[PDB]
Amino acid sequence: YNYRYRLFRKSNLKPFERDISTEIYQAGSKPCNGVEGFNCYFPLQSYGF
Amino acid sequence: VYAWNRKRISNCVADYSVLYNSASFSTFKCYGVSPTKLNDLCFTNVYAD
């Protein structure tokens, strides 16, 4: 269940980039910053293979 | 479930800034954005069930 992908980034990456930025981001514009909550979330998940 | 409540809307403005009467959408699931702050989406998918 382990092949990861990124679901949120502040912008799309450049050609052949391998960025490992992984912070919480805004669905509502709330500075949750290092912590999750409803309307603000962490950016990675993996396929249930 | 057995006979779910369909609905639709059209010819009006809209926003995720008004997506729910509580921002704690305790059963929500959103490929757009959950209820808080957004304001930029459109479709022929006027459905609003």
Cα torsion B5, B8, B9, B14: sign? positive
- CB under 8 Å, gap of 24 or more: what pairs does B22-29 form? B23/A28, B23/A38, B23/A39, B24/A38, B25/A38, B26/A38
Measured in whole angstroms, the distance separating CA A34 from the mean position of its chain's CA atoms is 12
The resolution, in Å, is 3.9
Strands A44-47 and A3-6: antiparallel
Contacts of A39 in chain B (CB under 8 A): 23, 34-36
Q: Choose from B19, B26, B28, B36 for mutation: most chain A CBs within 10 A.
A: B36
* Tokens coding A9: 């980034």
Cα torsion B27, A28, B38, A18: sign? negative
Cα torsion A42, B33, A18, A14: sign? negative
* Tokens coding A15: 């050609």
- CB under 8 Å, gap of 24 or more: what pairs does B27-32 form? B30/A27
Considering only CB atoms, A27 lies closest to which of B24, B26, B36, namely B36
Cα torsion A21, B30, B1, B23: sign? positive
Inter-chain touch A29–B37, beta carbons under 8 Å: yes
Question: What number of helices (H) and strands (E) belong to chain A?
Answer: 0, 4
- Other CB atoms within a 10 A radius of the CB of residue B16 amount to 20
* Structure method: cryo-EM
Enclosing H/E stretch for A25 = strand A25-26
Choose among B23, B21, B39: nearest CA to A39. B23
Contacts of B33 in chain A (CB under 8 A): 27-28
